[PDB]
Amino acid sequence: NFNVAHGLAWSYYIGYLRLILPELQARIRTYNQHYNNLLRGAVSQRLYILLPLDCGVPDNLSMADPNIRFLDKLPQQTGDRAGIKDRVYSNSIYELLENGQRAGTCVLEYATPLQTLFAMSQYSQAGFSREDRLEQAKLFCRTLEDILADAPESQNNCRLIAYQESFSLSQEVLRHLRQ
């Protein structure tokens, strides 16, 4: 079963991180210079990737924590991909609240393949148990860490936030953001 998370981690790098991480600093610089509110803090460098090991991935982050609120989108990145003209890669900027006030602003999202591991564990024909899922989530993160450790597109460009669940997601992101 090893090969499920191995494949998904390689697919996440090849099909997403290696394509968007090289251009991310320029998109954030563009946002900060031309789109960011004049009075607010600069959007932090780096893509922050949430890796819940229970593979609980809501689509709406902005509601999953009261202290994480959607602010804005980066400029879109588009390119021809496998016969799709101008396929769109979009990223969302979030404010992180601490004591009701803004403590940080960053590009934040879940690793969408963890949502796949979760769905595969639920489908009879995938032949993937809820025990397989925790082991595969750990292997997914370890494989991604190992890829990015040798990856030339990763130039201080992303931070992996792995966690297991009271737990505060905003505090967990702020701890990485403040390093």
Ligand X SMILES: Nc1nc2c(ncn2[C@@H]2O[C@@H]3CO[P@@](=O)(S)O[C@H]4C[C@H](Oc5ccncn5)C[C@@H]4CO[P@@](=O)(S)O[C@@H]2[C@@H]3O)c(=O)[nH]1
- Binding residues for ligand X, per CB under 6 A? 8, 11-12, 15-16, 82, 84, 87, 89, 109, 112-113, 115-116
Size of site (CB under 8 A) for a second copy? 53
Q: Is 1 in the site for a second copy (CB under 8 A)?
A: yes
Minimum CB separation of residue 66 from ligand X in Å reads 23
Question: Which C-beta is closer to ligand X: that of 1 or that of 97?
Answer: 1
Alpha carbon distance 172, 160 (integer Å): 11
Whether the CB-CB separation of 97 and 170 falls below 8 Å is answered with yes
Query: Which partner in a second copy, ligand X, none is near 50 (CB below 5 to 8 A by kind)?
Result: a second copy
Q: How far apart are CA 58 and CA 64, in angstroms?
A: 7
Taking the complex as a whole, the smallest distance from the CB of residue 82 to a second copy amounts, in Å, to: 4
Please say which residue, 31 or 128, places its beta carbon nearer to a second copy. Answer: 128
The number of angstroms, rounded, from the C-alpha of 162 to the middle of its chain's C-alpha atoms is: 11
Residue with tokens 């803004």: 102
Query: Among residues 82 and 99, whose Cβ is nearest to a second copy?
Result: 82
By a kind-dependent CB cut-off of 5 to 8 A, residue 16 interacts, out of a second copy, ligand X, none, with ligand X
Rounded to 5°, the CA angle 16-17-20 comes to: 80
What are the C-alpha distances in Å from 76 to residues 48, 86, 147, 165?
Answer: 17, 10, 25, 33
Residues facing 72 on adjacent strands: 93
Binding mask 76-105 for a second copy (x = CB under 8 A): x--xxxxxxxxxx-xxx-x-----------
Of 161, 165, 167, 155, whose CA–CA distance to 109 is shortest?
161
- Beta bridge partners of residue 71, listed in sequence order: none
Residues forming the site for a second copy (CB under 8 A): 1-8, 10-11, 14-15, 50, 57-62, 70, 73, 76, 79-88, 90-92, 94, 108-113, 115-116, 119-120, 123, 125-126, 128, 146-147, 150
